[PDB]
Enzyme design. Structure first.
Site, PDB file in Angstrom:
ATOM      1  N   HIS A   1       0.803  -1.224   0.000  1.00  0.00           N
ATOM      2  CA  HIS A   1       0.000   0.000   0.000  1.00  0.00           C
ATOM      3  C   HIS A   1       0.839   1.279   0.000  1.00  0.00           C
ATOM      4  O   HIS A   1       0.458   2.284  -0.612  1.00  0.00           O
ATOM      5  CB  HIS A   1      -0.911  -0.014   1.220  1.00  0.00           C
TER       6      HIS A   1
ATOM      7  N   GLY B   1       7.302   1.910   1.491  1.00  0.00           N
ATOM      8  CA  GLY B   1       7.572   3.240   2.048  1.00  0.00           C
ATOM      9  C   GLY B   1       8.984   3.729   1.750  1.00  0.00           C
ATOM     10  O   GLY B   1       9.175   4.752   1.087  1.00  0.00           O
ATOM     11  N   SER B   2       9.958   2.995   2.280  1.00  0.00           N
ATOM     12  CA  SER B   2      11.372   3.209   2.017  1.00  0.00           C
ATOM     13  C   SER B   2      11.875   2.352   0.855  1.00  0.00           C
ATOM     14  O   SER B   2      12.897   2.670   0.224  1.00  0.00           O
ATOM     15  CB  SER B   2      12.184   2.834   3.239  1.00  0.00           C
TER      16      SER B   2
ATOM     17  N   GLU C   1      11.016  -4.369   0.953  1.00  0.00           N
ATOM     18  CA  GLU C   1      10.702  -4.946  -0.347  1.00  0.00           C
ATOM     19  C   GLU C   1      11.918  -5.520  -1.031  1.00  0.00           C
ATOM     20  O   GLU C   1      11.833  -6.597  -1.589  1.00  0.00           O
ATOM     21  CB  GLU C   1      10.023  -3.925  -1.274  1.00  0.00           C
TER      22      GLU C   1
ATOM     23  N   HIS D   1      27.236  -2.633 -12.110  1.00  0.00           N
ATOM     24  CA  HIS D   1      28.133  -3.423 -11.234  1.00  0.00           C
ATOM     25  C   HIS D   1      27.514  -4.707 -10.684  1.00  0.00           C
ATOM     26  O   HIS D   1      28.180  -5.754 -10.629  1.00  0.00           O
ATOM     27  CB  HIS D   1      28.577  -2.614 -10.013  1.00  0.00           C
ATOM     28  N   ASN D   2      26.266  -4.611 -10.226  1.00  0.00           N
ATOM     29  CA  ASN D   2      25.681  -5.701  -9.459  1.00  0.00           C
ATOM     30  C   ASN D   2      24.799  -6.590 -10.332  1.00  0.00           C
ATOM     31  O   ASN D   2      24.276  -7.593  -9.849  1.00  0.00           O
ATOM     32  CB  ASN D   2      24.878  -5.164  -8.269  1.00  0.00           C
TER      33      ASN D   2
ATOM     34  N   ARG E   1      35.404  -8.562 -12.817  1.00  0.00           N
ATOM     35  CA  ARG E   1      35.398  -8.536 -11.351  1.00  0.00           C
ATOM     36  C   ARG E   1      33.980  -8.619 -10.814  1.00  0.00           C
ATOM     37  O   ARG E   1      33.739  -9.259  -9.803  1.00  0.00           O
ATOM     38  CB  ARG E   1      36.133  -7.325 -10.787  1.00  0.00           C
TER      39      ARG E   1
HETATM   40  O1  R10 Z   1       9.626  -0.264   2.474  1.00  0.00           O
HETATM   41  C1  R10 Z   1       8.987  -0.093   3.509  1.00  0.00           C
HETATM   42  O2  R10 Z   1       8.959   1.316   4.171  1.00  0.00           O
HETATM   43  C2  R10 Z   1       8.405  -1.210   4.294  1.00  0.00           C
HETATM   44  O3  R10 Z   1       8.822  -2.467   3.740  1.00  0.00           O
HETATM   45  C3  R10 Z   1       6.869  -1.042   4.329  1.00  0.00           C
HETATM   46  O4  R10 Z   1       6.361  -0.482   3.110  1.00  0.00           O
HETATM   47  C4  R10 Z   1       6.447  -0.118   5.496  1.00  0.00           C
HETATM   48  O5  R10 Z   1       6.927  -0.652   6.727  1.00  0.00           O
HETATM   49  C5  R10 Z   1       4.939   0.052   5.591  1.00  0.00           C
HETATM   50  O6  R10 Z   1       4.601   0.829   6.748  1.00  0.00           O
HETATM   51  P1  R10 Z   1       3.041   1.037   7.131  1.00  0.00           P
HETATM   52  O7  R10 Z   1       2.355   1.596   5.928  1.00  0.00           O
HETATM   53  O8  R10 Z   1       2.567  -0.323   7.539  1.00  0.00           O
HETATM   54  O9  R10 Z   1       3.087   2.020   8.283  1.00  0.00           O
HETATM   55  O1  R10 Z   2      28.411  -1.468  -3.030  1.00  0.00           O
HETATM   56  C1  R10 Z   2      28.780  -1.636  -4.205  1.00  0.00           C
HETATM   57  O2  R10 Z   2      29.179  -0.327  -4.863  1.00  0.00           O
HETATM   58  C2  R10 Z   2      29.344  -2.917  -4.781  1.00  0.00           C
HETATM   59  O3  R10 Z   2      28.827  -4.057  -4.085  1.00  0.00           O
HETATM   60  C3  R10 Z   2      30.894  -2.944  -4.823  1.00  0.00           C
HETATM   61  O4  R10 Z   2      31.525  -2.264  -3.718  1.00  0.00           O
HETATM   62  C4  R10 Z   2      31.402  -2.227  -6.101  1.00  0.00           C
HETATM   63  O5  R10 Z   2      30.872  -2.830  -7.285  1.00  0.00           O
HETATM   64  C5  R10 Z   2      32.924  -2.177  -6.173  1.00  0.00           C
HETATM   65  O6  R10 Z   2      33.390  -1.485  -7.341  1.00  0.00           O
HETATM   66  P1  R10 Z   2      34.929  -1.532  -7.803  1.00  0.00           P
HETATM   67  O7  R10 Z   2      35.699  -0.952  -6.667  1.00  0.00           O
HETATM   68  O8  R10 Z   2      35.387  -2.941  -8.017  1.00  0.00           O
HETATM   69  O9  R10 Z   2      34.850  -0.683  -9.036  1.00  0.00           O
END
Ligand code: R10
Ligand code: R10
Lengths: 156, 156
Positions: free
Chosen positions: A10, A68-69, A73, A100-101, A135
């Site tokens: 929601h 929300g944040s 999710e 990268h990921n 890498r």
């Molecule tokens: O990403 C998020 O902020 C979280 O996974 C939920 O969406 C959040 O806790 C919902 O909060 P609520 O609407 O139940 O107060």
């Molecule tokens: O948090 C992230 O930026 C990632 O998991 C790695 O730290 C990132 O791909 C590293 O990048 P690199 O130093 O090898 O360019």
């Protein structure tokens, strides 16, 4: 032209619907995994597991999960085998998540951005290619192996 | 309290050492899972899986994982059974991670903040209580059950 699976509770519902429309407008194929209407009390995991599961099963696809944040999710999506879900809170982080990921999914917070900012995050995510750099693939393979066995690899 | 497990790759290494020093000064017990030195080529998964495993196993502890964006690191931490690792990019998101998601870990991007911004994020994370509210617990339980069975919970 990307296929994109979307899931939201929601708190991300209104932004999800806006993203669906934007994705249609910009030539992509959004697939709504729910929530299908606003329900104040609904629970994020099912929608995120659904989007993440479908994304992994449909190679070349991407996913977006919203709350929300966005953190609950991405956490839930990341429990799905094979799924890599970044939290995208800027154009840069959306871009790097792909580059990268090789993240197939991003989480976005519906309470965190203007619509303009959110759509910019979405655009970066659907257009930024995976770099295929050695890498990054090595690191993805290490994580994949941990996911296969749940045996923690040794640290240097 | 409290024990805080830190893991970082080279991209989050210098911020990790700064955070450890800050946590000592604020009365916590930082535990460094590595990288213990700067190695430009090192690979994030092992350090983050180590941090997340140790955090989940240690009641009342928290964990912090760092990279460039923090995203590969939260992804790796979230593959650990029972771990919930948010990406904290602000004081609000660090606080909500604890309050709503009961995240035992956060990822932080070493490339994304000033040190002052990053330490504010850390402070919010280690000082914000888990709400214990019903709906948040319900959602965490649903996710824990999926981790246990891989039976995707039904969508409404
Ligand atoms: O990403 C998020 O902020 C979280 O996974 C939920 O969406 C959040 O806790 C919902 O909060 P609520 O609407 O139940 O107060
Ligand atoms: O948090 C992230 O930026 C990632 O998991 C790695 O730290 C990132 O791909 C590293 O990048 P690199 O130093 O090898 O360019």
């Amino acid at each position: 032209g990307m296929r994109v699976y979307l899931g939201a509770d929601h708190a991300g519902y209104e932004l999800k619907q806006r993203i669906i429309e934007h994705l249609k407008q910009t030539g992509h194929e959004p697939i709504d995994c729910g929530a299908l209407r606003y329900d104040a009390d609904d629970d994020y995991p099912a929608f995120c597991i659904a989007a993440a599961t479908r994304t992994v099963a449909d190679p070349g696809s991407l996913g977006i999960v919203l709350g929300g944040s966005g953190n609950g999710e991405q956490i839930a999506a990341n429990k799905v085998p094979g799924a890599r879900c970044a939290l995208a809170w800027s154009v840069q982080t959306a871009a790097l998540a792909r580059e990268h990921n090789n993240a197939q999914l991003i989480g976005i917070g519906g309470r965190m951005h203007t619509v303009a900012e959110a759509l910019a995050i979405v655009d970066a995510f659907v257009t930024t290619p995976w770099s295929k750099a050695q890498r990054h693939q090595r690191r993805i393979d290490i994580l994949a192996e941990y996911e296969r066995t749940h045996e923690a690899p040794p640290v240097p």
